[PDB]
Scaffold this active site. Structure first.
Site, PDB file in Angstrom:
ATOM      1  N   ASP A  13       0.829  -1.111   0.124  1.00 44.08           N
ATOM      2  CA  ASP A  13      -0.103  -0.097   0.111  1.00 44.08           C
ATOM      3  C   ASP A  13       0.872   1.234   0.213  1.00 44.08           C
ATOM      4  OD1 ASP A  13      -2.141   1.842   0.137  1.00 44.08           O
ATOM      5  OD2 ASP A  13      -3.156   0.534   1.744  1.00 44.08           O
ATOM      6  N   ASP A  15       1.084   4.147  -1.930  1.00 44.62           N
ATOM      7  CA  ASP A  15       0.795   5.425  -2.764  1.00 44.62           C
ATOM      8  C   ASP A  15       1.539   6.688  -2.687  1.00 44.62           C
ATOM      9  OD1 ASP A  15      -0.572   7.450  -0.372  1.00 44.62           O
ATOM     10  OD2 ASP A  15      -0.683   5.069   0.007  1.00 44.62           O
ATOM     11  N   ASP A 214       3.003   3.439   3.970  1.00 47.00           N
ATOM     12  CA  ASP A 214       3.841   4.751   4.181  1.00 47.00           C
ATOM     13  C   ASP A 214       3.148   5.951   5.138  1.00 47.00           C
ATOM     14  OD1 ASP A 214       1.814   5.557   2.304  1.00 47.00           O
ATOM     15  OD2 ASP A 214       3.235   5.863   0.758  1.00 47.00           O
TER      16      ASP A 214
END
Lengths: 234, 232
Positions: A13, A15, A214
């Protein structure tokens, strides 16, 4: 002798860390993710983005044919080799984009909540809002089982909005830049759980899983992982 | 301003009274829909003069409409701020098309008769309309209606010549129409939908009504589309 390897699964995940933003069909990660795939270390992209956007991104990263989690777990793309799995090729929440749009319009028309969805504008406006091209902005508009929006009202109006969504079986999800409305019983963790269980039944062996996020809001997905790291680019 | 709920109606010959006048059976109904803010946007191959007349008899004056297969777009009454108000016409006018059509006929001797080549009485006779309505049928802003009088092989070389010149040759129930190749009921519908959406800040929901398979392009850009047939 043929043998099904113990699954070693990466849930990504990431992005705005893994992807090149201005860059095109040409992703710096692609050569790398291609060799991982060939060694049987599947990287499962997980995102709030639409199925269509995710599938194009998957292709440019060299991961086509692998499972992925789109629309916050409302859409699950099955592995190419999973023809026999009930739900193949894709598991979409029973609450579609269409029915959510109906709900949101009713709430807007009747209660005057102030917001603008991705559906209310053309893709040149989404290109501006996201920094995508018109073409990627177009795939960013093709939701199957969720709605993306910009919330333009107050925090108390938002609170009465979540409550109202919740009593209708919908959740209101805060992403990096936008909000997302989707089936309350869907989620990145739920989707991941199902994917993990599938690899486990097919192989006969417990998968070992790694999650990469992140930020602190990657927590749900990352909670279900055996190993979880937060990554920060330099 | 509320979410737009828009109806695109391409139903000349189902909606309209076959014989009747300024007195349309659909008018009281459509007047009430207009008051409820469910705009019915009429869509036709018919000319702008004709369609503005029909719109008024149906209770729909002041609403957008699509004329001449999309070569003409009447804007809403309330769209004075929209570039192109009151009416957006293809930059290829009826006069220019007539010039092209006559050049082909004189130089290449294609056999055909346009609605411009005859009097009102002859149009009334071809269309069954009254002389007065036939006159509106004869006023074109950005297209030409014609009867083809040549062979199919000659027709094929005609479509190609027209295509090279930026023009399309579009078959209707009875007659052929010549207009800007970049125009369409679908293109015009998209533009109207996009305008309602810009002015409202909300995605309009759209319904198309057609009465045959020839209505594919218009019905295709609609969220919801139905074929309606008069019962018997």
């Amino acid at each position: 002798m043929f043998s099904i390897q113990q699954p070693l699964l990466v849930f990504s995940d990431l992005d705005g860390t893994l992807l090149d933003s201005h860059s095109y069909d040409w992703q710096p990660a692609a050569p790398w993710l291609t060799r991982l795939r060939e060694a049987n270390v599947p990287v499962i992209l997980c995102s709030s983005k639409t199925s269509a956007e995710m599938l194009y991104l998957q292709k440019t990263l060299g991961l086509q044919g692998l499972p992925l989690i789109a629309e916050n777990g409302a859409v699950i793309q099955l592995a190419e080799q999973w023809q026999e799995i009930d739900g193949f090729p894709r598991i979409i929440s029973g609450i579609s984009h269409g029915e959510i749009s109906l709900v949101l319009n009713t709430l807007r028309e009747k209660e005057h909540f102030k917001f603008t969805t991705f559906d209310d504008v053309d893709d040149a406006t989404i290109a501006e809002w996201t920094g995508l091209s018109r073409s990627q902005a177009a795939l960013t508009q093709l939701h199957e089982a969720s709605v993306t929006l910009i919330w333009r009202d107050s925090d108390e109006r938002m609170a009465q909005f979540t409550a109202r969504l919740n009593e209708l079986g919908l959740q209101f999800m805060q992403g990096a830049r936008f909000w997302h409305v989707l089936d309350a019983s869907a989620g990145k963790d739920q989707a991941a759980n199902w994917i993990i269980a599938t690899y486990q039944q097919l192989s006969g062996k417990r998968p070992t899983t790694l999650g990469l996020g992140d930020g602190p809001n990657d927590a749900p997905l990352l909670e279900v992982m055996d190993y979880a790291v937060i990554v920060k680019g330099l």
